[PDB]
Structures are given as structure tokens and as C-alpha cells.
Amino acid sequence: LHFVDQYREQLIARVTSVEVVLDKLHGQVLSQEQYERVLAENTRPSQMRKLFSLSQSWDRKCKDGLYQALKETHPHLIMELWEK
Amino acid sequence: LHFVDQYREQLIARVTSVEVVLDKLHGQVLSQEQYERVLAENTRPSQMRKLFSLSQSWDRKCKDGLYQALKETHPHLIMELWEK
Amino acid sequence: LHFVDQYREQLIARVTSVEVVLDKLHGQVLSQEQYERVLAENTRPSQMRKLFSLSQSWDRKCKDGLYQALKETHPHLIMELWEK
Amino acid sequence: LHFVDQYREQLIARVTSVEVVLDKLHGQVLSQEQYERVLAENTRPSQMRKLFSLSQSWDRKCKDGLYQALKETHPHLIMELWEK
Amino acid sequence: LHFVDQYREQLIARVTSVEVVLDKLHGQVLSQEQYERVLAENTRPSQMRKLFSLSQSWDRKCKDGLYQALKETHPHLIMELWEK
Amino acid sequence: LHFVDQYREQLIARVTSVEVVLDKLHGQVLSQEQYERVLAENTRPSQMRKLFSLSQSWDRKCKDGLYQALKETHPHLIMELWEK
Amino acid sequence: LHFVDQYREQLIARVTSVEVVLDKLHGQVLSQEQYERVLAENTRPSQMRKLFSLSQSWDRKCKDGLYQALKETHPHLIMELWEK
Amino acid sequence: LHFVDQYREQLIARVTSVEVVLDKLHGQVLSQEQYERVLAENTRPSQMRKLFSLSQSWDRKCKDGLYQALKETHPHLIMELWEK
Amino acid sequence: LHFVDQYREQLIARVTSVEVVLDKLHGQVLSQEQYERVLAENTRPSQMRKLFSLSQSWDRKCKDGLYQALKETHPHLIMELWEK
Amino acid sequence: LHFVDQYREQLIARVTSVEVVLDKLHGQVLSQEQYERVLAENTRPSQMRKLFSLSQSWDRKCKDGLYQALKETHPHLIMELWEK
Amino acid sequence: LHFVDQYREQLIARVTSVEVVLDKLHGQVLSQEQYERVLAENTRPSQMRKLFSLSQSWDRKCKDGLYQALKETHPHLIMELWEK
Amino acid sequence: LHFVDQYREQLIARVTSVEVVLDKLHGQVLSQEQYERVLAENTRPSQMRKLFSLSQSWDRKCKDGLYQALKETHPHLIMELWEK
């Protein structure tokens, strides 16, 4: 069981800079359509929720990419959950 | 007879934050499918209704978990029903 | 029947300083999520409407708090309705 | 046969300010549930349609209330149909 | 002969809030199965019909309960028929 | 003379939940074939009739089981007949 | 006597996710026709009923498969019956 | 036995972009009606299910087309099943 | 010879709203049993046929009631046959 | 034989705005019940089908009215079929 | 011996779009009654079965029409059987 | 076969200025209702899709008008597809 799959209920309520963490994954994991659909929600918590709805088709390449981007953007949050 | 099973007709007309009380139960009690099916109703009273249709396969672990989450989200609602 | 519950059709069309009456209620009655969700409407009449959708889970503590904040912000409006 | 019951096919294609004419009827004719259900349609013509589905249980008090509110909101439309 | 048993042909064409009048009877008169079977019809007039098919096993407790809930939900319909 | 053997003309005109009272008796009193044959009638009064056609080979075990299941499903009907 | 053959009256009133437990058995035990026929019932308790009507041609391979799928989908229900 | 016909139980729980894989097949294999009927389900897992109900009249052209489109949309999923 | 008794082969091929013309006759002419039996046919032409099988025990009250209800529901068909 | 009765197989595959062509016919030809039943189909081609099942009791007023409404909504379709 | 009369057991297990192949035959070969009766089955394989029960009164016009419509809707199935 | 009807899968993923190509077609081909319904989608790819659902009732006048407006708005895209 991966790191993101266990604390999923914790992250969806605290990540703020949705746009800059959405940017880095554009070229590899997801196509154009999935990038566009996220703009429909128009609230910080809801958007992230929709993203985790696509966790059904992630394998280790894609989950590991997500953990990579989330460690590069915030060195205080990922640290804070990993300590527990 | 448990607390939730007797006053069931009272809660389905008053619970507001459907999403945040659905969030906490994801990882343990129910699978992904039951989590997705609830989005179909698209009205605050109806959604909760569908959830109580699954009370057929709950035992004390699950009823006690739900009572726990409802005590954590509203410290005024559960209080108000427990007084009566 | 409380004061706010009777003239509800009167208030939603005249309250101007939505932000400063939303501020005082933050710490006690409602959580973070309901505070954020109100930003979706983006019009003075619509926003207040959404707030009154949550009156289903208010008891005397919360209704009385709202009456309190509305008396502190506008000493001309609440008086004007109370005279009639 | 009342005024609203005869020209029903005419009104459902022209009424614009659905929200403010729905507001005035809240306290007397319909309960909370019917007030909430109308938000499901999300199109100006469809919503009013659903409202007329409740004409089955209106009597003269309620039809007269509806004609009253529709005369108070638009002094050009109700006049325009009554002339014919 | 009870009130519900004589004007049965009048009610099946006018009751709108099927769901909220079905809710109140859940705990005492009927079991879970009859509560679920009503969802099969999926039209306002048809559903109520099926309910009256169970009038064969009602005695005064159950007829009186139904009359009670229908007086509590609509104070205009029961009034309007009782006057005649 | 047993309870069911005397009011045989009374029950066949009032029992509604045929399926759930047929269910409980499956494992002990009757075999699979008689369970299947009852589906041929396709009417609430007729089906029950067919069941009583097997009263020729019941002894106290089976009649007592039937009275048991019918008291468990309807606590209002069996009471209502036993009072008289 | 197998596990499913004794507590059959217990399962038909509690299994909720009919579709996802019907899925796993598709490839080996039953053909396409029996898979399609189950859609006719359109109620959670009834559908499951029809499945057990095919228990006439099951041997240990098929009963063991069904017990397998029901243990994989719900680790709380099969446990709760196995304890008694 | 083809690739899609063996791992059918694997795909129906993981395919995300239903719309864009439905789009490419329009012009050749299926008519307009089958394209329209898929909108009824309104849930990610259910929709795809209905599509596989038409596998009765596919031959190598049509199955091969489906494998082609599913390889073009997700270069990570089809890989992941083909490795095993 | 009455009106309905002469054109018996004409009506059984054209009456559509069987249910709403069956409703009006419930309270006086026919009992509950005959009302329930009609649901067995499940086709518009066949149902009416069964009703005319009971013309053996009709007198003028009941035939006149039937002609009354069919004139009240359809003002175009009864006219069209009466002209000829 | 009327225009609508001959080309019936052509229209049922092309009429799009079911709602606005259903609106105009409400007041004269059909009652409320038939107006409500049409919402059950929930697909553009199927709905029209059900409507044509009622052509059994139409005379020249009703068929001619339908041809009128269909000429008022689409001045391009009725023209296109009438040319042939 | 015609084509349809030889592969009768082959077609009844593979034809999917029952409705659109039933549509084209309406105007010439069969009347309204047989067109309505097919709706009773409510399963894809069974419906077609009933159709072939009318093969007792087909001559070359009607068999040739059915083969025509079945070649027009599916250009892959008729091909696949004709090759063998 | 027209130009738009063959490369329809190409256009639905690239057209940007929905509003200005919807404007020019207002007065002739489609009525007010179809113009209003398109606002429901609220995503650039989805909207155009809905428009192509009305291709069932276009003839050469309307398809030719659509091709005209799309050639007038973008002199780079229509050229780009016509070259292939």
C-alpha cells in the first residue's frame, strides 16, 4: 500500500497551490482532457477530490510521479505526514 | 437497538455536510463502488437516504464508526438528539 | 418561532456587508468548509441565500448568535424590522 | 377555470426572475422539500415546469397567491396576457 | 368505513410528496420489504396505488397512523376534502 | 382443532407478503418442488390458497411452524384474529 | 452440507453489491444467458433470490467459487455468520 | 480467445476516459442508436458494462478496433495487463 | 340492446387508458378481487377483454356506470361511435 | 390514410425537440396522465414511439392538430418529407 | 429452403438491436397487434424467438423482406453466416 | 457524404470560439430553445458535441450554412482538414 493511498483523507483538505502541482504532471501521466476537466469545480478542496477519482488507473510510475511533485512543491507538508 | 437505528427518521432531514462525513468512512467500511454510487442523487436529503439503505450489512464496528464521525462533525446535532 | 425564521424573505434582499457579518461566526457555529463554500455565488443576494440553506442544523445557540452579530453590524436595519 | 390554469403553456417560456418569485411563496403554500427540489433542473424553462407539476394540490388560496406574486414582480407580463 | 377507504379514488391523483409521507410510517406499520418495493413504479400516481394494495391488512392503528401523517404533511388537502 | 384450520377462509383474503412467509418455511417442512409450484398462480389470494391444499399431510410440527412465522411477520393480524 | 446451503435464508436479505459479486463468477461457472436474466428483477433482494434457483446443478467447484467471491467482497458479513 | 474476451473482468473497473474511447469508434462499427443509449447509466463503471453487452455481434474487425482504440488512449493500462 | 353490448368487438381494439377508466368503477359495481385480477394480462387489448367476460351478471346500474365513466374519460371516441 | 399514418417510420428517428412539441398539445387532445407518463422513457427516439401508440383513438381533429404543431416547430422537416 | 429457415438456432443468440429491425417491417408484413405483443418478453434473446413463431404464415415476400432488413442493419453478421 | 459528416471526430476536439460560430447561425437554421440549451455543458469540448446531436434534422441548407460559418471564422482549420 502506497503513501498517497493511505492518507488520502488528509491531503484533500490542505493542499493549496493546485495549479502549480497540476502543471508538472501534464506531459507524462494524463492527456489534455483530464487536465481541462479539473477547472469545472471552482473551489480548492473539490478540485483535488476529482483528481483522486483517477487513482483507479495509476500504477507505480504515476503514483511515484505524484509523490515526486508533491515533495518538490511542499517540503513541510509531506514531511509532516511522513513523520507520524 | 442502536442509537442510529431508532432516530433514523430525524437525521435524514437535517444533515448538511454530506461530503465531509462521507469522507472519513472511505478507507475501512465500504469499497469504492458504494462511494461512487452516492453522487447520483444530487440533493441533500436523497443522498443520505441511499446511505441508510446499506445498514443491512452493518455490525457494531460500522454503526459505532458512523456514530463516531457524526459526533466529530456536529457537536450540536448529535448532542441535541441525545438529550431527548 | 424565532425572529430570523419569520422575516427570512425580507433580509436576503437588503443586507450589504456580507463579508463582515460572515466574519464573526467563524469560530463557533460552522466549520471551515461551509465558510469557503459561500464564495461560489459571487452576488450579494445569492450568497446570503446559501447561508440560510444551513438553518436545518441550527439550534438556539446558533440562531441566537446570528441575531447577535446582525444586531452588532447594523443598528438601523434590525430595529426597522423589529418595529413592525 | 382560473387564469393561470388556461395560459399555462404561455408562461413557461417567458418567466425570467424565477428566484425572486419563488422566494415570496416560501412561508405558506409549500414546505422546505419542494423548495429545495427545484434546484435540480438548472435551466430557466425546466424549473417552472416542475413547479406547475404541483398544481394538482393547489386550491384557491394557493392559485390566488401565485397570481398575486406574479402580478407584483412583473407589471408588464401579467397585464400583457390579461389584455388578450 | 374510514376516511381513507371512501375517497381513495380522489387521493391517488393529488398526493405529491410521496417520499416524505412514506418516511414517517417506516418504524411501526410496515417492514423493510414493502418499503423497498414501492421504488419500482417511478411515477407519482402509480407509487401511491401500490401502497393502497396493502390496505387489506390494516386495522385502526395503521389507518389512523396514515391519516395522521397525511394531516401533518398537507394541512390544505385533508382540509379541502374533509369540508365536502 | 388448530388455530389455522378454523379461520382458513379468513387468512386467504388478507395475507399480503406471501413471499417472505413462504421463505422461512423452506428448510424444514417442505421440499423444493412445492416451493416452485407456487409461482404459477401469480395473484396474492390464489397463491395462499394453493399452500393450504397441502394441509392434508401436516402434523403439529408443521402447523406450529406456520403459526410461528405468521406471528413473526404480522404482529397486528394474528393478534386481530386471536382477540375475537 | 455446504455453508451456503444452510444459511440461505440469511444471505438473501443482506447482500447489497449484487453486481460486483455477480461479475467475478462470469468466466467459469455460468453462461451469458443466466447473467442477463438477473436484470429482470430490479430490486436488491429479488435478484439474489433468482441466483440460488440455479443451485440444482452446482457441484463443489461452483459452490466453493461462490463462497470465495462472497468472502472477497465482504470480509465482515461472511465472518459474522461464520462466528455463530 | 481474444485479449479483450479473457480479461473482461479486469477492464470494467479501471477505464476512466469513457467518452474519448467511445468517440473514435463512431464512424465504422456501430450506428447512432447504440451511441446514444450509453448515456443512460451515468456512472463510470456501469456505462462500460453496457458496451460489453454488444460483444455478441463482434468479429475480428470490431474486437481488433476496440483493442486498437484502447491501446491508443492509455499506453500504460493495456501494457500492464499484457505483461501478465 | 344496450350501447356497449352491440359494439363489443369495436371498443376492445381502441381503448387506451385502461387504468383510469378502471379506477372510477371501484367503489360500487365490482369488488376488490375482480379489480386485482385484471393486472394479470399485461397488454392493452387483452385487459379490456377480461372485463367484458363479466357482462353475464351486469344489470342497468352497472352498464350505465360503465358508459358514464367511458363518456367522462373520452369525449371523442364515444361520440365517434354514437354518430354511426 | 393521413400524412402522419404513412411516414410513421420516418419521424420516430429524427424528432429532436420532444418537449416543445409536447407542450402545445396539452390543453385539448390528451389529459394530464398521458402527459406525465411520457417522462418515463428518457431517450429522444423512444419517447415519440410511446406517443404513436395512442394513434388508435385519434380522429381528424387530433391527427390534424399534430401535423399543425409539427409544421409550426420545424418548417424544414415537414417540408422535406412532403416534397417526396 | 430459405436462408432464415436453416440458421434459426444461430440468429436467436446474436441479434442485439431488436427494436430497429422490428421497426422497418411495420408497414407491410405485420399488423399492429403482433408489433405490440413483442414488448412482453423484456429480454434480448427471448423477443426474437417469439418472432420466428410466426414463420408458419410467411411466404417469399415476407421472408425476403426480413432478410433484407437484417442485411441492412448489420452488414457483418449476415456476411459472417453466409460465408460458412 | 458531406465534409462535416466524415471528419466530425476531428472538429469536436479543436474548435475554440464557440460563441462567435454559434452567433451567425441564430436567425435561420435553429430556434430559440436549441440556442439556449447549449449553455448547460460548461466545457469547450462538450458543447460542440451537443450541437452535432442535431445533425439528424439538417439538410443541405443547414449543413452548408454551418460549413459557411466555420470557414468564415477560422481560415486555418477548415483549410487544414480539406488538404488531407
UniProtKB/Swiss-Prot annotation, chains A, B, C, D, E, F, G, H, I, J, K, L:
Protein localization: Inflammasome
Domain CARD span(s) in chain numbering: 1-84
Outcome reported for the amino acid change (mutating residue 14 to D): Abolished formation of an inflammasome filament together with PYCARD/ASC
Effect of residue 80 to R: Abolished formation of an inflammasome filament together with PYCARD/ASC
Substitution effect: residue 76 to D: Abolished formation of an inflammasome filament together with PYCARD/ASC
Documented effect of changing residue 44 to E: Abolished formation of an inflammasome filament together with PYCARD/ASC
Coiled coil: none
Impact after mutating residue 17 to R: Abolished formation of an inflammasome filament together with PYCARD/ASC
Variant or mutagenesis effect after changing residue 5 to R: Abolished formation of an inflammasome filament together with PYCARD/ASC
Outcome recorded upon mutating residue 24 to D: Abolished formation of an inflammasome filament together with PYCARD/ASC
Effect after changing residue 24 to E: Abolished formation of an inflammasome filament together with PYCARD/ASC
Mutagenesis / variant outcome for changing residue 42 to E: Abolished formation of an inflammasome filament together with PYCARD/ASC
Effect of residue 19 to R: Impaired ability to induce programmed cell death. Abolished formation of an inflammasome filament together with PYCARD/ASC
Effect of residue 14 to E: Impaired ability to induce programmed cell death
Top-rank taxon: Eukaryota
UniProt comment concerning the protein's domains: The C-terminal part of NLRP1 oligomerizes to form the core of the NLRP1 inflammasome filament: in the filament, the CARD domains form a central helical filaments that are promoted by oligomerized, but flexibly linked, UPA regions surrounding the filaments. The UPA region reduces the threshold needed for filament formation and signaling. Must recruit the adapter PYCARD/ASC to facilitate CASP1 interaction and polymerization.
Function: Constitutes the active part of the NLRP1 inflammasome. In absence of pathogens and other damage-associated signals, interacts with the N-terminal part of NLRP1 (NACHT, LRR and PYD domains-containing protein 1, N-terminus), preventing activation of the NLRP1 inflammasome.
Complexes and interactors: Interacts with the N-terminal part of NLRP1 (NACHT, LRR and PYD domains-containing protein 1, N-terminus) in absence of pathogens and other damage-associated signals. Homomultimer; forms the NLRP1 inflammasome polymeric complex, a filament composed of homopolymers of this form in response to pathogens and other damage-associated signals. The NLRP1 inflammasome polymeric complex associates with PYCARD/ASC. Interacts (via CARD domain) with PYCARD/ASC (via CARD domain); leading to pro-caspase-1 (proCASP1) recruitment.
Protein name (record): NACHT, LRR and PYD domains-containing protein 1, C-terminus
Gene source species: Homo sapiens
Full protein segment contained here: 1379 to 1462 of 1473
